[PDB]
Design a protein around this ligand. Sequence first.
Ligand SMILES: C[C@H](CS)C(=O)N[C@H](Cc1c[nH]c2ccccc12)C(=O)O
Ligand SMILES: [Zn+2]
Ligand SMILES: [Zn+2]
Ligand SMILES: [Zn+2]
Length: 231
Amino acid sequence: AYPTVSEIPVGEVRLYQIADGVWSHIATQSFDGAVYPSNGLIVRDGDELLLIDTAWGAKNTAALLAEIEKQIGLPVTRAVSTHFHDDRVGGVDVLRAAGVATYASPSTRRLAEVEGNEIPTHSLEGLSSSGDAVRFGPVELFYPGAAHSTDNLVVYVPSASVLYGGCAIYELSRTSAGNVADADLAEWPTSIERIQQHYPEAQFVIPGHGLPGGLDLLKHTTNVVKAHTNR
Ligand SMILES: C[C@H](CS)C(=O)N[C@H](Cc1c[nH]c2ccccc12)C(=O)O
Ligand SMILES: [Zn+2]
Ligand SMILES: [Zn+2]
Ligand SMILES: [Zn+2]
């Protein structure tokens, strides 16, 4: 039932309902010769919507906004990017031109600028130390420490028991490390343990790329990271 790369041509976006008022968005992109899928989140906020992450590029993110209007029909008023890579901020300029207020931590905004990537407009306070959490509309934002990147955030929806891990959490079918160029391999297992301690009641866990599952995805990611460390 969850859509895969074989079903989404590059340039198209699908939506998947996880629980009442909570969807994932799924898109695809070419990277150095191959095609990969990528997930973000949509959370209903009264009569408005909060978006978590772009759809990995300008064309994909325009298609995302069109699909949201067709299928859900409520305005996207705010967006949060969970780290500085192009699958999270690529498309921020399209969001801004459409009137969406874009947000990220000051750490993410700095790293995006250094990389020459698109830069969310607004800065999120209260997330500078490992273990920090803040409320943002219908979600909680949590900084677990450095992992896939030094700035990575995770997102929890308390009304639905949905944990969105972004690219700090791997899907079960991935048994080898992927893009680790910006990672803190030494701290990644400790950061995962902070997530487990803060969200033990999570029922649905969504990785940055691929299939959702349960809390087992956390220990799975620690196993993959430690195996890579011992390469
Ligand atoms: C451009 C993005 C930024 S996080 C990126 O590099 N993403 C890769 C995605 C990836 C690498 N190997 C795979 C195998 C199966 C499914 C996904 C992948 C990552 O997060 O490691
Ligand atoms: Zn990344
Ligand atoms: Zn990613
Ligand atoms: Zn495993």
